[PDB]
């Protein structure tokens, strides 16, 4: 994360790290939305323009982290995928629309002081929470700057959802409805953004209705990390719930 801080133990029991088998490296973040399914972005598994095309084979899933580095001995828990489901309209060529993927872990993850699922947005919550100026909470083991170096710890950043239009005149990228930008305006006097390494990460919110937390976004793209005038684009998790719940109720856990 860029211009953020350390996660305190158990800040994000949902937050999951995707991590290459061989070459054994981190590829992204996920958020577990339950003892079996995990929410990641697709471009983490499939970006044909850079040869990103992993498979269930190729990936590793480790739930309950904090240290970016060490293998968190009695906390962190490592899982194997059973299957990945990119979104049929995933659009890797153009602009990244419905840049969402699921992946069902092989077998269930025990919950714990450290492992806990996040709330999926409801029609109602979606309505009330997604509003400009309202902060969101994004997370992980990503570049500490654009280019340089990386944390030894999870970083958390508090960033404000940006006006629909403003996101827009920010990129010649052809923005869509399954996209929501997030930021501190140029002159708003405060920084942070997600970054190369960040993606699949959850962009959470807390209903002051029940005080539970929700996934609004997903880390998706943007140009650089904390460029002045640039805002990270997430995935309208809401916008895509429907498919999101079609599959878990299909061939799920």
């Amino acid at each position: 994360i860029v211009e953020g801080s350390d996660a305190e133990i158990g800040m994000s029991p949902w937050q999951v790290m995707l991590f290459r088998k061989s070459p054994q490296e981190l590829l992204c973040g996920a958020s577990l939305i339950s003892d079996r399914w995990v929410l990641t972005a697709a471009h983490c598994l499939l970006y044909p323009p850079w040869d990103k095309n992993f498979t269930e084979n190729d990936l590793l899933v480790r739930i309950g982290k904090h240290s970016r580095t060490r293998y968190e001995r009695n906390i962190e828990k490592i899982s194997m995928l059973e299957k990945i489901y990119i979104h049929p309209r995933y659009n890797w060529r153009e602009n990244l629309d419905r840049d969402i993927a699921l992946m069902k872990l092989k077998k269930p993850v025990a919950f714990s002081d450290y492992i806990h699922p996040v709330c999926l947005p409801d029609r109602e919550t979606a309505a009330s929470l997604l509003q400009a100026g309202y902060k969101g909470r994004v997370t992980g083991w990503g570049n500490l700057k654009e280019t340089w170096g990386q944390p030894s710890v999870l970083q958390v950043v508090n960033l404000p959802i940006v006006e629909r239009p403003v996101c827009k005149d920010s990129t010649r990228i052809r923005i869509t409805d399954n996209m929501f930008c997030a930021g501190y305006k140029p002159d708003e006097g405060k920084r942070g953004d997600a970054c190369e390494g960040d993606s699949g990460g959850p962009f959470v919110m807390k209903s002051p209705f029940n005080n539970r937390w929700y996934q609004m976004g997903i880390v998706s793209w943007g140009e650089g990390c904390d460029r002045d005038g640039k805002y990270g684009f997430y995935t309208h998790v809401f916008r895509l719930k429907k498919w999101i719940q079609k599959v878990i109720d299909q061939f799920g856990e």
Binding site: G10, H116, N158, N211
Partner: peptide
């Protein structure tokens, strides 16, 4: 069920050092 309620944070009625930035947004 008992989605998004942290076992050491909401779960024990403590809040994080920044949660609070977040409900102050909503005004």
């Amino acid at each position: 069920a008992d989605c998004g309620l942290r076992p050491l944070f909401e779960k024990k009625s403590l809040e994080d050092k920044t949660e609070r930035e977040l409900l102050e947004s909503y005004i």
